[PDB]
A paper describes a structure:
The second library, LL2, used a more diverse codon set encoding mixed amino acids (F, I, L, V, H, K, N, Q, Y, D, and E) for four randomized positions on each of the Z domain and the affibody, so that the functional diversity (1.91 × 109) of the yeast library almost reached the theoretical nucleotide diversity (4.29 × 109). The highest affinity mutant from each library achieved approximately three-log enhanced affinity, KD of 1.99 nM for LL1.c1 (LIFFK/FILF) and 1.86 nM for LL2.c3 (LVLF/FIIV) compared to the original dimer (KD = 2.92 μM). For example, A-LILFK has more Z-B binding partners (B=77) than A-LIFFK (B=15) from the LL1 library, and A-LVLF (B=53) and A-VFLV (B=42) are also more cross-reactive than A-IVFF (B=3) from LL2 library sequence data. Binding of VFLV/IVVY and LVLF/FIIV are highly enthalpically favored and entropically disfavored, but by the end of the trajectory we see a more moderate enthalpy of binding coupled with a moderately disfavored entropy in IVFF/FILV. Although we could not observe any structural features that distinguish cross-reactive versus selective complexes, the thermodynamic properties of cross-reactive mutants (A-VFLV and A-LVLF) and specific mutant (A-IVFF) differed. We do not observe systematic differences in the structural parameters of the interfaces mediating specific (A-LIFFK in LL1 and A-IVFF in LL2) versus cross-reactive (A-LILFK in LL1 and A-VFLV, A-LVLF in LL2) complexes.
Author numbering:
A (entry chain A), B (entry chain B): 0 to 57
């Protein structure tokens, strides 16, 4: 029974999603909720947030 | 049981911390780790981060 906490991936994804300039507050909150619920998906969720950020570029 | 959700406090304090212009990268990352881990302490963490920012003004 390995204990995976996903510290590296989760902490990076939280920090990077806070940093993405083009997301609105509700979108950020949705990502944070997904991260809190399933840290194993942190890399996919960060990738999805980056795509959304880019699609909302000015 | 009461469910204290700190989604808004996290995003708001987190955005304020990550935008303080005089904090360095590891400082911001450390604050965000502490905030994610205990979001009930958002007010204290933001206050500490703001003081640090102001002590590092150019």
């Amino acid at each position: 029974a390995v204990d995976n906490k996903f510290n590296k991936e989760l902490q990076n994804a939280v920090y990077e999603i806070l940093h993405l300039p083009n997301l609105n507050e509700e979108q950020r909150n949705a990502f944070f909720q997904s991260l809190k619920d399933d840290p194993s998906q942190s890399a996919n969720l960060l990738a999805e947030a980056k795509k959304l950020n880019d699609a909302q570029a000015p």
